[PDB]
Amino acid sequence: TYLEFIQQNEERDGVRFSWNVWPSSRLEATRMVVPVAALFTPLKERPDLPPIQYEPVLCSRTTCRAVLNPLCQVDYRAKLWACNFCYQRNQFPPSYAGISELNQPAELLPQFSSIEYVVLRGPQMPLIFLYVVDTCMEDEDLQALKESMQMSLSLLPPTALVGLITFGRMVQVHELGCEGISKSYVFRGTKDLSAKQLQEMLGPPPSNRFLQPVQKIDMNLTDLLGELQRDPWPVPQGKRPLRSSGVALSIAVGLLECTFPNTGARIMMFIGGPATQGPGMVVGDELKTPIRSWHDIDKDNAKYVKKGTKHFEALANRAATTGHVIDIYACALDQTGLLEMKCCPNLTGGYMVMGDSFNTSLFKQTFQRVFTKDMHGQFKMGFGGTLEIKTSREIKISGAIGPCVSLNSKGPCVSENEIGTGGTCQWKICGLSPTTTLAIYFEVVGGRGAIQFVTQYQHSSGQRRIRVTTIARNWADAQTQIQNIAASFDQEAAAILMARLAIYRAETEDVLRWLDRQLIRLCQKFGEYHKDDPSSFRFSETFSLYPQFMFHLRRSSFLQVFNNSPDESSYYRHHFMRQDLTQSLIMIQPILYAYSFSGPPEPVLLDSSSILADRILLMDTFFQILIYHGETIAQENFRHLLQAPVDDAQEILHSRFPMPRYIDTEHGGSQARFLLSKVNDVSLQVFMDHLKKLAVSSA
Amino acid sequence: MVLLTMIARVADGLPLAASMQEDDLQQYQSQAKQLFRKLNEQSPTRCTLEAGAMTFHYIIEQGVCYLVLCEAAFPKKLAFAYLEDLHSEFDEQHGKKVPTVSRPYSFIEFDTFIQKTKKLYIDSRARIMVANIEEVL
Amino acid sequence: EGLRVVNLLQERNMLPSTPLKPPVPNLHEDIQKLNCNPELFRCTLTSIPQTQALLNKAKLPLGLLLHPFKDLVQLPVVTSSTIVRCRSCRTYINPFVSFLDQRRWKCNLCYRVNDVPEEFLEPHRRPEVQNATIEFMAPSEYMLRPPQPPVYLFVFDVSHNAVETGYLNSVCQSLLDNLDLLPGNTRTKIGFITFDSTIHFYGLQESLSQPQMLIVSDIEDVFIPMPENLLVNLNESKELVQDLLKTLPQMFTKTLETQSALGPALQAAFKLMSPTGGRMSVFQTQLPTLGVGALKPREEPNHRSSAKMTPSTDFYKKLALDCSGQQVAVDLFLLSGQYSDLASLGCISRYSAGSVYYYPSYHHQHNPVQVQKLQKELQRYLTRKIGFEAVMRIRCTKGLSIHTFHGNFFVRSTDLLSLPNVNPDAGYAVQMSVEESLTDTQLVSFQSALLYTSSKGERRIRVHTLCLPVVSTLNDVFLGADVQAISGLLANMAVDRSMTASLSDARDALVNAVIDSLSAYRSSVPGLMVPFSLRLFPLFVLALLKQKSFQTGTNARLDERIFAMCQVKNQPLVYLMLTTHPSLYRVDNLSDEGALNISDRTIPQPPILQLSVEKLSRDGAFLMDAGSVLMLWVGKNCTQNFLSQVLGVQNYASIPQPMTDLPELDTPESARIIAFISWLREQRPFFPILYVIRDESPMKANFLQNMIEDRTESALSYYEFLLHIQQQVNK
Ligand SMILES: [Zn+2]
Ligand SMILES: [Zn+2]
C-alpha cells in the first residue's frame, strides 16, 4: 500500500516527499506541477535506535565523502565497499577488519537507514543560557515572570553557564554572585554597541564573570531573580514606558558573540511590551498613537516598521552566523513588535511564544515545556546543527524553507533555480528539537534516485552527534512515466509544501493567483474529464483532497492577513514553517469532533452543516482548542457528554508545544465566532465548481 | 506632568516650604511669588491659571496657599488631589505655628513629605476657576 | 612700643620670645574697641596711605586678609525683620557709621545719608552698630531658591595602586564614626561613587538585600544610571549606608585596574549633584591616565635643575566652573606616591571654593605619619561647620578699590566671590590701590559679607567690618605696617607671579619688596636701618624664600611645591606664618613662668627661639610648632631624666623609630610637657599630630629644613641675606 509506504517512511526516516517516484526524463522533470520536495524532520524520535559510538565511515573521494549506508554495495570478501553516490570504491577502516557477513555494521541494514553516530574527542562545551528580561510591565506580570525563570533555573544542567540581563530605559548586564554587593553594568538603551566595543567596555571548564556554571551560581541567581523590580524610571501621564528592547537584545548577542562564539547558547528574551526607543523601535511613547496595524502598514502610516525590522534582521543574522539561538517570549495586552523581531527566532531555531500575560497557565505552562526532558533527564533540544544533503548526480537542490540559514556552500548539488534559502548544499540550524521540520526543494537535471541527509549538532549532553538518513526513491519507468508519478503522489505532503512556498513569498512579497494556476494545472494533468464538461471531472483517491486543502489554505489566516494583527500573523507563520506534516494540516484545516448521545465522539466536516444544536463540538486549531455547545446543550449521562470533549481536550492540550489557547463557548456566545470562521472565492462547493469549469476548458 | 511645589502664608506671601529639581525654574518661580503677593482674603480659595505650555494649580486653607506648576497636559484632577494631601498633612503638623513664624522657609523639613508624596502622582503606574495667569498678575 | 629705628646688622636677635601680636590701628579709643577682630579681618597697612603716590613711595603692598567664616566663641544674631543697608552702596549699617539726625545716618563707605527706619528704634544702641562681627538672617529675597539641603557625595579611586595604599579603609571608618556628626538636619543626603577605568555608582534601597553597584563603562559619554536611590536620605537610610561603608573596603582587594579615569568620574559625580549642589569629596591616589582629563607623566626635578607650575590642561578648571555654577564645590584628597600633576588637578578645587588635602606617599602600613594625619584631618573635615550655595562681596569706602583676589572661589563680577561651599578653615586675601585720593576722609572702612545657606536650611549673612585711619606721611605708613600681613599678601602675589611668569620672577619680586621698601625708607631718613615695624621683614621673606613653595636648591618634588602654593592661596594668615616660620621652643626643662592660671593646669611658657641650629643643643630636646604638626627633636647627648621620665626609654638608642606621640607617664615632667603640647593644639581647630621620630639619625630630620637662618649649599643664611639687602639698599 502506497499509504503504508508513506507512513513507514516518515516513521523511520522522518521524511515525506511530494512524489515517491521521480521523472526519469528531462521532458517530465521540467513539466512537474508540484516540485519534488520533502518535508524533512532531522531529529524525529522513534523506537530507541542504537547510538553508534564509532566514527561513521566516510567515502574516500574529496568531493563526495558520503556516509556508508544500506544503499552502498559491499564485498565482505575484499573488505571493500562502493559508494552509491559516486561509485568510488572504498577500503574498510581498521576497526572494521573483523567485518563479517553473519555480523555486519549497523549502518548497512535497511532498518538503520536513518541512524545516529556519536563523536567523542574534544571536551564538550557546557550549555549557555542568557536570560534577557524586560522590567517594564505590571507587578503581577513581573512576579509571574520571575517565578517562571526561577523554575527554569532548577531544571538546567549543573554544567551549563547562565547570564542575566535586565532592561527598561537602560540595559543592565549582571556580573553574577560578586558577594556582598551584587553588581551590573549599565548601558543606555539609546545607542547600539557592536561586540568589540562591548568586549572592551566589559573586559578545566570555562566561564566569564557574566556566564557562570549553574551549580556554583544557582543560589545567587535564584535570589537576584527573586529581587528583580520593575524599571525604576517613572511613566508620566499618557506615556508608554521607555523600553530599550532593541539594544538589550544586541548587547545580549554581542555578549555571547565575544565570549563563546560557535557553540550552543540560548538567548531567551522576555517582553512585556513593544520597543519604544530604537534602534529596533516599534512605536512611540505617546499612548495617543496606537501600535501599527496591517491597515496602517498598507497605507504607509507606520514609520518604524522597516528601520525596526532591519535592526532585528541584522541581529538575527549576527546570532545565526555565530551559531546562537534567539528565543522571544512576549506577553502583553497590546502588540509587542513580533513583526519586526520575527527573524531572530525564525532564522535561528529560536522559539516564539505569545500570550496576554506572564501571569497565566498558558505562558507558565508553555514556558516549562521548553525544558521537557527525555528518558535520560536531558533537554529535547540540539544546538548549532549543520544540515548537508548529498544527492545522486541526477538531483539538484533549489532550496529550503524553514528555520535555517545558508552556509552558502557551492557544489554540483546546487541548482541555478533557488527557492527560499537556496544556492547551498549546507544549512545551519542553530536551535532544533525532535519537531523541527525544514522543507527541501529538489530538482531533476534500473531505478532509484538517492538523497542523504547529514545532520551534525551539539546535544544537551554536550556530546556532538551526527544524524544520518539516506532515502531512495524509484526512477519512473519510461513506458509508464506519468501513471507511476501520479500513483506516488502525497497530496498532504504536497499541500503543505505548496503552502510553504506561498507563505514564504507572501512574507517576502498575487500569491493566491500562483496557488490557483497550479491547482488548475494539477487538476488538468492528473484529473479525469471530458473537455468543456465540468461534471465529468473526478480525481483519484490519490488527489481528491488536494483541492480542499487548497480551499482552506487560501482562505486561512496565513495569507489573508487583515482581521489579524501583524504580530498574530508573524506568530502563526513562524510556527507553520517549523511543524511536521500532521500538525501543518491541522493548522490549515482544523479537525472537528462531534459529541452527542447518539453515538460516541466522531470527526465531522468543517461545514456549517456540522453545527448541530444537540451536539458538542471540539475544534482543534493547532493554535487553539475550542469546545462548542449548540443552543440545546447550552443548558451521569448528560455529564459523560458535557465532559467528553473536556477530557479529550486535556490530552492533546499538553503534548503540543505552544500550549493552544483553550475555549469554552456556545451558540450565542461571542467566542463562538472562532468556530464560525473556520467552518464552511466563497464556499467550497462554489470553489469546486469554478475549479471544474476551468479544469475542463483550455489549458 | 512635571514638578514645582510651593506652600506660602497668604497674608504676606512668606514662603513656608518648597521643592524643585531640574536635572527654567527662574521664570515660573517669579510668577509663583507674584501670585502669592496678589493673593488675599478676597482671592478664590481654589483656582487654576493658564500660562502657555504651563498651568498653575492652587488651593488655600487657614491662610496658607498650596501652589503647584506643571505642563498643562497634566491632569487638573490629579493636581488638586496632590495639593489636598499636602494640606491635611501640613495643617495637621504645622497648621498652628504658621501664623507666628517670620523666617523664610521655616519648614524646609517639610521637604521630605512633599517629595515622597510628589512621586505618588507623577507615575501613571501607581495611580475651581480658570484664568490666564497673565491676568491676575 | 617704639617709633625707633633698628639696625638689622647689630641686633641679629630681633625675633621676640613671646608670640607676635597684630598691630593696633591708630584710632580713637572708642572706635578701636569696636573694631573687628584682627584674627577675622586685617590690613597690611593699618594706616591707609591717603594717595596712590604716597602708597607707591612706600613700596609696600596694600591689601586685606580675611578668615570670614572662622569658628567664633560668641556671635550676635540679628533677626531683624528688616536689614538696614545704605540705599546707595548697600553697605550694612555698621558700628562705624556716623549718626547725626539721630534718625539719619551717614554711610561710612559711600557717605550717603540714610533714613533710619521706625523699626531700628537710641538707634546707636542697636546691636548692628555695637558689633563689627554679626550674623543676619537673610529675607525671602536674598535667595534664588529654597535653601538647598546638605548633600555629601564621596568619590573614591579604587585602582590597583589605590587599593595598595589602603586609604579607603580608614576613610570609610572615619565616615562611619562621624555619620551622626555631619552638619545637617533630616534633609541630609549622602552618596558614593568608586572608580577605576569605569564609574561605579551605588544604589541603596531598603527593599533590597544589599546595595547595588551600577557601573557605567561608557567613559566618553557618562550619565546617571538611576533616578532615585543614588543620593539617599542619610536619616532614613542610616543602616543601609553603614553596611556599604563596612563593605566597600573589601570589594577591591584583588584588583588589576592599573588605570584611572578620574576625568569621566568627576563628570558623573557632577551630573549626579548638578540638581542640588553640595560637597564632593574626591580621593585620588595617582596620575589620571584614562579618558578625558588624562594627564601626561612628568620627570621630577633635582637639586640641580634651575628655576625653568602651571596646568598642563584646562579640563579641571572648566569642570570646576561648571560645578561652581551648580553650587557644587570639590575637595581634593591626593594620596599619591608619584607625580600626579596636581598643578592641573588642583584647579578642580581652586575654582569651586573647595580645598585640596595632600598625603604624600600615603600607606596603611608603611607611612604611619600620613595615616594619623589623614585621620585627624578627616575628623575636622567631617565635623566642622559648613555653609552652602554662598557668595561673598568685599566693600571698601569710596577712593579705595580692590583689584586682585586671592583664594579658592570664582569671581563673577568684581566683588562677588562665588563659594559653592564655605568652610571655616578657608582664608582669603585682596589687593587694593587708591583710585581716588583720600583728602576728604580721615577714616575708611572695609566690610565683607557672607551670604549662605546653613546646614539647617536657613539663609544667613555674616558681616565683618574694619575701620582704619588715613595718613599722609611716609613715616606714618611705615609706623602702621603689619609685617606678617604683608608677608602673607606677598606670598599670594608670589604664587600668581609664578603661574604668570616664573619661579625666578616670583622669587625676585619677593626679594625686591624688601629692598624697595627699606631703600625707600632710607631715602627718607651705615648699617641696615629699618623702622621697628619691619625688623622682621627680611627674616619672614627669607623664610618665605626657603619654604617648599618658592625654595629652589632643594630636592623638593613637583606636587609638593604646588600643594605648598595651594595652601598659601587657601590658608588664614596664622597658618601661613606657622608653616613658613615655625615656632621653636626648648622642652626638656620646662618650668613655672607659665600660664598656671588655668585653675588646675599650669602650662609652661618657654621662650620662642629663632630658627637656627645655633640654638639647638645636643644636651636638650626641642619642639618645633609648624602649625600642622609638632615635630619634637631630641638631642644625642640628651639628658637621662628626659629619656625615662618623658620619653619612657632608658637611653637614646631605644627611642622607637617612628614615634607617633609621647607616652603619658606619671611624672611631673611628663605632666608639664603634655600640658604645653595640649595648650598648643587647643589654640587651633586642626589637631596637629606630633612625632618625636626627629632623632639625630632617623632620616626624617626635615626638622632642619626649617632652620631658615642657617645657610645651605643652595640658599643664603639670614646673615648673608641681610648682607645682600644692604648692598642693594644703598647701591
Ligand atoms: Zn562517494
Ligand atoms: Zn553707602
Taking the domains of chain B in order of start, what are their residue ranges? Answer: 1-137
Interface of B with A in 40-99 (CB under 8 A): 73-75, 78
Q: How far is the CA of C108 from the centre of ligand 2 (A)?
A: 7
Rounded Cα gap, residues C179 and C168, in angstroms:
16
Q: Is B13 left (phi over 0), alpha (psi -120 to 50) or beta?
A: left
Give dist(CA A12, CA C157) in Å, integer. 67
Task: Look at residue C271 and give its three-state secondary structure.
Answer: helix
Does A230 sit within 8 Å of B124, measured CB to CB? no
Residues 6+ apart with CB under 8 A from C689: C369, C372, C373, C376, C629, C630, C660, C661
Residue of A nearest to C221 (CA): A188
C-alpha cell at C111: 557717605
Crossing angle of helices A546-555 and A581-588, in 10° steps, is 60
Residue A485: closest CA among A2, A10, A85, A41: A2
Quick check: B26 contacting A, CB < 8 Å?
no
Using alpha carbons, list the distances in angstroms from residue C536 to A66, A643, B30, C8, C59.
105, 113, 57, 9, 16
Whole-angstrom Cα distance, residue A498 to residue A34?
Answer: 7
Phi first, then psi: give them for residue C578, nearest 5 degrees. Answer: -60, -35
| A297, β-bridge pairs | none
CB atoms C147 and B108 under 8 Å: yes
Contact C138 B29 (CB under 8 A): no
Give strand ranges (E) for C116-255: 133-137, 151-157, 189-195, 199-203, 212-216, 232-233
Cα A67 to middle of ligand 1, angstroms? 8
What is the Cα–Cα distance from A326 to A316, expressed in whole angstroms? 8
Q: Could you tell me whether strands A161-167 and A533-538 are parallel, antiparallel, or unpaired per DSSP bridges? A: unpaired
Any B CB within 8 A of A235 CB: yes
Domain C1-21+471-581+711-731 has CATH 1.20.120.730: yes
What does the alpha-carbon distance between residue C561 and residue C712 come to, in Å, rounded to a whole number?
19
Coil, helix or strand for A390?
Answer: strand
For C29-35+75-131, CATH number?
A: 2.30.30.380
Cα(A530)–Cα(C532) distance, integer angstroms: 141
CA dist., res. C11 & res. C69, Å (int): 39
> How remote is the CA of residue A444 from the centroid of ligand 1, in Å?
20
> How far is A395 from A442, CA to CA, in rounded Å?
7
Cβ proximity of C578 and C568 under 8 Å: no
DSSP state of C324: H
Which residues in chain C touch residue A180, judged by CB atoms under 8 angstroms apart?
Answer: 210, 247, 250-251
Domains of chain A: 1-52+114-124+381-476 (2.60.40.1670), 53-113 (2.30.30.380), 125-380 (3.40.50.410), 477-588+682-699 (1.20.120.730), 589-681 (3.40.20.10)
For residue C504, the tally of other CB atoms under 10 A from its CB is 14
List beta partners, residue C65.
C42, C429
Residue A238 to residue B122, Cβ atoms within 8 A: no
Q: Which of A475, A465, A366 has its CA nearest to residue A148? A: A366
- C32/C469 Cα distance (integer angstroms): 10
Strand order in the sheet with A624-629: A602-603, A591-595, A616-621, A624-629, A661-666
Calpha distance C513→C492 (Å, rounded): 13
Q: Pairing mode, if any, of strands A661-666 and A624-629?
A: parallel
Q: What is the least distance, in Å, from the CA of C274 to any CA of chain B?
A: 7
Residue A239: CB atoms within 10 A of its CB come to: 16
Instruction: Give the Cα separation of A589 and C582 in Å (integer).
Output: 101
Cell of A679: 467552518
Q: Which helix (H) or strand (E) holds A3?
A: helix A2-13
The answer to whether C138 contacts B104, with C-beta atoms less than 8 Å apart, is: yes
Q: How far is B26 from chain A (nearest CA, A)?
A: 23
Report the separation in Å between the CA atom of A81 and the middle of ligand 1, taken as the mean of its atom positions: 10
What separation in Å is there between the alpha carbon of C113 and the centre of ligand 2? 8
Instruction: Characterise B102 by phi-psi region: left (phi > 0), alpha (psi -120 to 50), beta (else).
Output: alpha
CA distance A661 to A623: 7
CA atoms within 13 A on the CB side of C529: 13
Residues A167 and A245: beta-carbon distance below 8 Å: yes
C-alpha cell at C513: 619688596
CATH number at C582-710: 3.40.20.10
**CB-based contact (8 Å) between A50 and chain B?**
no
Q: Scan for cell 502669592, then name that residue.
A: B36
Instruction: Provide the H-helix boundaries in chain B.
Output: 25-38, 76-94, 111-118
**Does A59 appear as a known binding residue?**
yes
CA of C86 to the centre of ligand 2 (A): 5
- Could you list the beta-strand ranges (E) of A272-425: 325-331, 352-355, 382-391, 395-401, 405-406, 414-420
Beta-bridge partner residues of A665: A628
Mark B54-73 as b/e (b = at least 16 C-beta within 10 Å). Answer: bbbbbbbbeebbbbbbbeee
Closest C-alpha among A600, A605, A650, A588 to residue A625: A650
What beta strand segments (E) does C138-245 contain?
A: 151-157, 189-195, 199-203, 212-216, 232-233
Interface residue C276 vs chain B (CB under 8 A): yes
DSSP conformation class of C45:
B
Across the strands, what pairs with A541? none
Query: DSSP letter at A421?
Result: B
User: DSSP string spanning A336-370?
Assistant: --HHHHTHHHHHSS--EEEES-SSSHHHHHHHHHT
B1-137 — its CATH code? Answer: 3.30.450.50
Cα–Cα distance for residue pair C615/C638, rounded to 1 Å: 15
d(CA A455, CA A465): 8
Compute how many other C-beta atoms are within 10 angstroms of the C-beta atom of residue C210: 16
Q: How was this structure determined?
A: X-ray
Residue A685 CB contacts under 8 Å (≥ 6 apart), including other chains: none
Q: Evaluate whether A333 touches A290 at the Cβ level (below 8 Å).
A: no
* All three cell numbers of C13: 636677635
Q: Quick check: A238 and B119 CB within 8 A?
A: no
* Resolution attained, angstroms: 2.8
Task: List C-alpha distances in Å: A362 to A658, A662, C694.
Answer: 9, 9, 81
CA–CA separation, C248 and C261 (whole Å): 19
Any idea which residue has 466522531 for its cell?
A602
What's the CATH architecture for C36-74+132-139+385-470?
Sandwich (2.60)
How far is A264 from A260, CA to CA, in rounded Å?
9
Q: Are A118 and A51 in contact (CB under 8 A)?
A: yes
Q: How far is it, in rounded angstroms, from Cα A617 to Cα A642?
A: 10
Among A180, A184, A229, beta carbon nearest to C215: A184
* Residues with Cβ within 8 Å of residue C411, at least 6 apart in sequence: C405, C417, C418
Residues C227, A170: C-beta atoms closer than 8 Å: no
CB-closest option in B23, B104, B111 to C187: B111
Out of C214, C229, C247, the one facing A180 most closely (by C-beta) is C247
Q: Is C558 in a helix, a strand, or coil?
A: helix
Burial readout C92-117 (b: 16 or more C-beta within 10 A, e: otherwise): bbbbbbeeeeeeebebbbeeeebebe
Task: Give the Cα-Cα-Cα angle A182, A185, A189 (nearest 5 degrees).
Answer: 135
Rounded to the nearest angstrom, the gap between the alpha carbon of residue C545 and the centroid of all alpha carbons in its chain is: 19
Tell whether A236 lies on the interface with C, counting CB pairs under 8 A. Answer: no
| Residue C543: C-alpha distances to residues C169, C560, C715 (Å) | 38, 17, 11
Amino acid at C287: L
In a mutagenesis test of the A interface, which of C213, C228, C257 is the best target, namely the one with the most A β-carbons within 10 Å? C213
C-alpha cell at C343: 598643578
What span, in angstroms and rounded, lies between the C-alpha atoms of A342 and A576? 13
Helices and strands in chain C: count of H runs, count of E runs: 20, 28
**CATH number attached to the domain at C149-384:** 3.40.50.410
Are A243 and A136 a contacting pair, CB within 8 Å?
yes
Q: How far is the CA of A397 from the centre of ligand 1 (A)?
A: 18
User: Could you say which DSSP state residue C108 is in?
Assistant: T
A35 half-sphere exposure, CB direction, 13 A CA radius: 26
Is C566 assigned to a binding site?
Answer: no
Cβ of C283: how many Cβ atoms within 10 Å? 23
SS3 C386: coil
SS3 A427: strand
Residue type, C74: Q
Q: How far apart are CA A582 and CA A47, in angstroms?
A: 19
CA of residue C429 relative to chain centroid, distance: 11
Neighbours of A92 (CB within 10 A): 19
Chain C contact set for A188 (CB, 8 A): 218, 221, 223
Partner chains of C (3+ C-beta pairs under 8 Å): A, B
Phi and psi at C41, nearest 5°, equal: -145, 135
* Grid cell digits, residue B78: 490629579
Q: How many CB atoms lie within 10 A of CB C689?
A: 21
Contact C617, C635 (CB under 8 A): yes
Residue B75 CA to its chain's centroid (Å): 15
Beta strands in A500-554 (DSSP E): 528-530, 533-538
The residues spanned by each domain of chain C are 1-21+471-581+711-731, 29-35+75-131, 36-74+132-139+385-470, 149-384, 582-710
User: Which amino acid, one-letter code, is at A47?
Assistant: P
Residue type present at position A698 = S
A311 touches A279 (CB < 8 A): yes
Beta-strand pair C5-7/C48-49: unpaired
Residues 6+ apart with CB under 8 A from C122: none
Q: At what angle do helices A546-555 and A511-526 cross, to 10 degrees?
A: 170
> CA separation (Å) from C566 to A174, C380, C427, C477, C492?
43, 19, 11, 31, 10
CA pair distance C173, A537, nearest whole angstrom: 96
As given in the structure block, the three cell numbers for residue A663 are: 475555549
- CA neighbor of C621 nearest in space, from C659, C580, C581, C578: C659
Within C340-367, residue ranges assigned H as helices are: 342-345, 347-350
B47 min Cα distance to partner chain C (Å)? 24
Give dist(CA C445, CA C163) in Å, integer.
53
Q: What CA–CA distance (Å, rounded) separates C716 from C723?
A: 10
Residue A328 CA to chain centroid, in angstroms?
14
Q: Which residue has the cell 482544523?
A: A590
Which candidate, C138, C174, C410, C145, places its Cα nearest to that of C277? C145
Nearest by CB to B123, which of A138, A234, A238? A234
Residue in the block written with cell 540581563: A165
Name the amino acid, one letter, at C191. Answer: G
Question: Could A183 and C227 be called an inter-chain contact, meaning their C-beta atoms sit closer than 8 Å?
Answer: no
CA-nearest residue to A234 within chain B is: B123
List the end-to-end C-alpha distance of chain A, in Å, as a whole number.
32
Ligand in nearest proximity to the CA of A81 = 1
Q: Edge-to-edge, what's the strand order for the sheet holding C583-586?
A: C583-586, C621-625, C632-634
H or E element that contains A458: strand A449-458
Rounded distance, CA C146 to CA B115, Å? Answer: 14
Q: Which residues of C touch A223 (CB under 8 A)?
A: 209
Name all chains with 3 or more CB-CB pairs below 8 Å to chain A.
Answer: B, C
The torsion defined by the Cα of C291, C295, C299 and C302, in degrees rounded to 10, comes to -140
Long-range pairs, A48-52, Cβ under 8 A, ≥24: A48/A375, A49/A112, A49/A115, A49/A116, A50/A106, A50/A115, A51/A116, A51/A117, A51/A118, A52/A106, A52/A107, A52/A115, A52/A116, A52/A117, A52/A118
What's the rounded Cα separation, in Å, for the pair C505 and C495? 10
- CA B77, B83, B85, B87 dihedral sign is negative
Q: What are phi and psi of A355, to 5 degrees?
A: -170, 180
What is the rounded CA–CA span in Å between residue A324 and residue A266? Answer: 6
What are A650's three cell numbers?
486535556
Cell digits for A600?
460516541
Sorted by sequence, the CB contacts under 8 Å of residue A118 that are 6+ apart come out as: A51, A52, A53, A463, A464, A465, A466
Cβ atoms C166, C365 nearer than 8 A? yes
Q: How many CB pairs under 8 A join B and C?
A: 49
State how far the Cα of A384 lies from the Cα of A363, in Å rounded to an integer: 26
Side-chain-side CA neighbours of residue C493 (13 Å): 26
Is residue A72 annotated as involved in ligand binding? Answer: no
